[PDB]
C-alpha cells in the first residue's frame, strides 16, 4: 500500500514508472503547414496518452481508486501531464521545446499554427524556471504525480469521502517525499519550505497553460484543422469547451 512506502521507495517507484520518450512522425521532405504541425503534435500526444495510462496505474494510490475516479483524474490532468513532461525534456534546450528527439521546435516554427505561439512562449518560460531552479528528476516525478492526484480531486454517496481522503493522504506522502529529497540534497529547513512553495506554485502556471491549451485544441477541432483520435476527442470533451 502507498501509505506504508518510505520516501526512498516512493521515489524509486516513480522513477521506474517513467514512460519512454517517443519519436514524432516528423517528415522532413515537406515544409510545415498549420495542419501538418498540428497533425504531428496530436499523433504524438495520442501515442503518449497510452503510456500515461500505464504510468498512472503505477503511481501509488491510483489503483485503489474506482475506475470512474481514475477516469476523472486522467481526464482532468492529461494535458497538464503532457506539458510538464515537455517542459522537463526541454530544460537543457534553451529557446526550444523538445516535443520529441526528432521534433525540437523554436517559437518561430509553430507561429505557423494559429494561437500556438502564446502557448509555446508560456511553455518556454516554464522550462526556463525549471532550469533556473535546477529541478531534479526525483522532484519532477513527484510533481507529475501531484498533478495526476490533485487536479481533479476537488471536482469528485458515502464512498465519495473515503476516496477523497485516500487521495489527500497519498498527496501528503508525496509532500513528505519532496521535503525528504530536499533535506538529503542539503537544503536548510527554511530553504526546504521555500523550495516546496516555489515548485507547487509552478503547478498553477501549468494548470493555466493546460486551460489555454485545451481551448486552442477545441478551436482546432472546431475549424476542422486536424482529425483527433477517438481517445483525444473524449479527453477533450471532458473539458466541455464552448
Amino acid at each position: 500500500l502507498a501509505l506504508s512506502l518510505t520516501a526512498d521507495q516512493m521515489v524509486s517507484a516513480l522513477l521506474d514508472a517513467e514512460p519512454p520518450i517517443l519519436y514524432s512522425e516528423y517528415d522532413p521532405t515537406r515544409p510545415f503547414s498549420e495542419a501538418s504541425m498540428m497533425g504531428l503534435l496530436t499523433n504524438l500526444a495520442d501515442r503518449e496518452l497510452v503510456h500515461m495510462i500505464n504510468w498512472a496505474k503505477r503511481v501509488p494510490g491510483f489503483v485503489d481508486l474506482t475506475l470512474h475516479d481514475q477516469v476523472h483524474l486522467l481526464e482532468c490532468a492529461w494535458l497538464e501531464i503532457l506539458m510538464i513532461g515537455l517542459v522537463w525534456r526541454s530544460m537543457e534546450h534553451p529557446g526550444k521545446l523538445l516535443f520529441a528527439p526528432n521534433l525540437l521546435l523554436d517559437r518561430n516554427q509553430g507561429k505557423c499554427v494559429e494561437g500556438m505561439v502564446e502557448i509555446f512562449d508560456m511553455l518556454l518560460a516554464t522550462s526556463s524556471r525549471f532550469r533556473m531552479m535546477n529541478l531534479q528528476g526525483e522532484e519532477f516525478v513527484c510533481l507529475k504525480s501531484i498533478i495526476l492526484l490533485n487536479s481533479g480531486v476537488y471536482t469528485f454517496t458515502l464512498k465519495s469521502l473515503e476516496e477523497k481522503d485516500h487521495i489527500h493522504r497519498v498527496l501528503d506522502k508525496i509532500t513528505d517525499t519532496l521535503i525528504h529529497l530536499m533535506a538529503k540534497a542539503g537544503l536548510t529547513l527554511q530553504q526546504q519550505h521555500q523550495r516546496l512553495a516555489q515548485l507547487l506554485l509552478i503547478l498553477s502556471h501549468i494548470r493555466h497553460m493546460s486551460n489555454k491549451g485545451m481551448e486552442h485544441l477545441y478551436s482546432m477541432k472546431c475549424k476542422n484543422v486536424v482529425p483527433l483520435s477517438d481517445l483525444l476527442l473524449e479527453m477533450l470533451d471532458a473539458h466541455r469547451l464552448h
Binding site: 495510462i53 496505474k57 481517445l231 473524449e234
Partner: peptide
C-alpha cells in the same frame, strides 16, 4: 457509450 479511457485503464 463505454469511454475509450475506461477500457484502456483495464488492460
Amino acid at each position: 457509450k463505454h469511454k475509450i479511457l475506461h477500457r484502456l485503464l483495464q488492460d
